[PDB]
Amino acid sequence: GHMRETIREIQKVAYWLAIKGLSEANAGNISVRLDERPEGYEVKSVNEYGFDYDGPEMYLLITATGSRMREVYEDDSKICLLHVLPGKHYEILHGNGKPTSEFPTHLMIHAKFKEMNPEKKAIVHTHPLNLLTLMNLEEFQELLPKMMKIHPEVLIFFPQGISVVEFEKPGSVELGLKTVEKSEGKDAVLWDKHGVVAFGKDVAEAYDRVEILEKAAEILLRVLSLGRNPTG
């Protein structure tokens, strides 16, 4: 049941996210794009995109609204299986509520990914403490570079590196469109002031990039905490 296992893969990530403090409260969502189609076909509900979707057809699993990682790892009812049909309607196959507010945003990256990089099927958005802390510094832009090579680990997972995105509207189509542009063949986008979003062949890989980015941020911050490295 390719889809039912994917769920476990998502739940496992939700757990690690919560246990390592990478995600708090309900600030954080995950989304995976299903390739084939759900075997246990079961339309429970139909809903309005709230906007006009004109991208290809797809099935995607995304955390529901109000969902907290310390919970979705336990209760799979907190994960939504959806069938994305052009037009203004999408249907709910699995879930107890409506997807997350930032569903629209994910939508956009997903659509483009399906066309652009079909390999990337997973998206993890969370608010890492250190990356957060780091983006609270005026001379933030001028650190990302040195931060991007604090240890090999980053280079590998981010051969091209990362890009920041001027955060305007929460879970808007725009946010997505914007994100996709900066996310050109890249594997991570930092929503300035609002955490990060990571992509990957699968959720586990997306999670792996969050961890790594965090570690680099954390290492950078401690080094600065002793006054020793290229600030300007």
TrEMBL record:
**Which keywords describe this protein according to UniProt?**
Lyase, Metal-binding
One Pfam annotation reads Aldolase_II
**What InterPro entries would the database entry show?**
Aldolase_class_II_sugar_metab, Aldolase_II/adducin_N, Aldolase_II/adducin_N_sf
What species is this protein from? Thermotoga maritima (strain ATCC 43589 / DSM 3109 / JCM 10099 / NBRC 100826 / MSB8)
Q: Name one GO molecular function term.
A: metal ion binding
Keyword Lyase recorded: yes
Q: Which residues form the Class II aldolase/adducin N-terminal domain?
A: 8-221
Protein name, as recorded: Sugar-phosphate aldolase
**GO CC terms for this protein?**
cytosol
PANTHER family (UniProt xref)? 3-OXO-TETRONATE 4-PHOSPHATE DECARBOXYLASE-RELATED (PTHR22789:SF0), FUCULOSE PHOSPHATE ALDOLASE (PTHR22789)
Any single GO BP term: pentose catabolic process
